[PDB]
Amino acid sequence: PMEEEEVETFAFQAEIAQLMSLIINTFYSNKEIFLRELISNSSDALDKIRYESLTDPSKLDSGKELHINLIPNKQDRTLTIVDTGIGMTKADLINNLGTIAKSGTKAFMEALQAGADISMIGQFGVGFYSAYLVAEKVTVITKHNDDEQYAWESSAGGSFTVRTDTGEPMGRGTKVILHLKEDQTEYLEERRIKEIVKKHSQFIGYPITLFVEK
Ligand SMILES: Nc1ncnc2c1ncn2[C@@H]1O[C@H](COP(=O)(O)OP(=O)(O)CP(=O)(O)O)[C@@H](O)[C@H]1O
Ligand SMILES: [Mg+2]
């Protein structure tokens, strides 16, 4: 019996779309900082659930462990960053991951044009989009307490989609699945991941574990 799923498509805010095009169609060295940006997001989300659970300990019913997992998959060429942080509601996804303007976007594009290192992306308030330095497509699966599990996805080009996720349930948190570009497969290698975590993500505040398939 055929299943029916609803999909909603959203336009990125105009300057966010411009930034994504810049990131994708311009050569930048030092792309490895994408992972720092994603781990920083996870750490921030872990702080949020940690503090919320001081007010309401039942907010940890959906899982007490506060941690980050990194999962390279050489078979399907994906690198996944999973956290057990606060997650995002549907409204959070739509608002926070593309539709609302960020005040630093224009300044950042000017900085890049003038030769700034791509590592400055976080300072300008748009760190997530560093994912597109290495990924041709990004899928974000997320589960916030008191809301359903959702999947956000974009291959850039000006829009993203959101749908209720009918895949494997997560208790609470977010998974960012990077479908790596063919020339960026170094980020599936355990040595390289270890190197960049050590270099850029030394003060995370939560355990991080790298899972490596035999
Ligand atoms: N792992 C995650 N868990 C929960 N929310 C996340 C998330 N990753 C991203 N987000 C949401 O997406 C927003 C945008 O993330 P982004 O990294 O671009 O900016 P930011 O708010 O972290 C400032 P910065 O530029 O310093 O990183 C976050 O503020 C948060 O609301
Ligand atoms: Mg961030």
Side-chain angles (χ1 to χ4, degrees):
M2 180 163 63
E3 300 279 334
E4 322 159 50
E5 295 192 22
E6 167 169 282
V7 181
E8 297 180 69
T9 304
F10 300 89
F12 284 107
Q13 193 279 156
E15 290 85 60
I16 295 173
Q18 291 172 190
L19 173 63
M20 293 176 74
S21 180
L22 242 207
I23 284 169
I24 293 163
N25 295 300
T26 305
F27 178 80
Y28 298 98
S29 63
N30 201 27
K31 295 177 168 82
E32 67 193 44
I33 62 83
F34 79 91
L35 186 60
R36 177 193 72 205
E37 293 304 321
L38 299 179
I39 290 172
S40 287
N41 289 341
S42 291
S43 177
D44 289 349
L46 288 161
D47 289 340
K48 288 176 183 71
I49 188 64
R50 181 162 58 90
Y51 283 94
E52 285 200 15
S53 65
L54 301 180
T55 64
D56 186 353
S58 71
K59 286 183 175 300
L60 299 172
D61 284 356
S62 51
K64 290 184 181 187
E65 302 99 304
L66 302 185
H67 62 234
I68 303 171
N69 298 334
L70 305 178
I71 312 170
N73 182 327
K74 289 177 186 188
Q75 290 83 54
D76 72 2
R77 203 210 295 158
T78 62
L79 177 62
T80 301
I81 300 76
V82 186
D83 68 65
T84 55
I86 197 151
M88 284 174 280
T89 62
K90 188 185 175 185
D92 288 340
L93 267 179
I94 293 163
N95 289 329
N96 301 351
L97 285 186
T99 64
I100 300 305
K102 293 285 164 173
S103 54
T105 312
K106 290 178 169 196
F108 186 47
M109 293 187 292
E110 293 191 0
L112 289 177
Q113 286 291 171
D117 195 272
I118 196 68
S119 177
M120 296 303 316
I121 190 167
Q123 194 170 90
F124 289 85
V126 282
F128 168 83
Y129 302 94
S130 67
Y132 290 90
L133 293 163
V134 299
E136 64 194 7
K137 180 170 65 185
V138 179
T139 308
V140 179
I141 308 302
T142 193
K143 176 66 176 73
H144 183 113
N145 286 329
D146 310 297
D147 206 346
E148 290 185 271
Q149 191 163 304
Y150 298 98
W152 176 111
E153 186 167 81
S154 183
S155 300
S159 58
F160 64 94
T161 62
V162 177
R163 68 196 74 204
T164 302
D165 184 20
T166 53
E168 284 177 19
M170 314 166 59
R172 182 200 61 250
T174 299
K175 168 163 56 177
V176 178
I177 308 173
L178 306 174
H179 302 85
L180 296 177
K181 299 173 202 178
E182 62 86 21
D183 61 327
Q184 304 298 146
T185 64
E186 70 192 71
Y187 301 109
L188 304 170
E189 295 294 334
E190 51 265 39
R191 187 190 306 291
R192 184 68 172 129
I193 296 164
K194 287 193 308 189
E195 180 186 26
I196 68 179
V197 171
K198 187 65 161 49
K199 187 183 324 170
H200 295 111
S201 301
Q202 277 281 75
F203 307 99
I204 295 168
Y206 299 95
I208 184 154
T209 303
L210 174 60
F211 293 85
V212 177
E213 175 73 28
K214 195 182 209 304

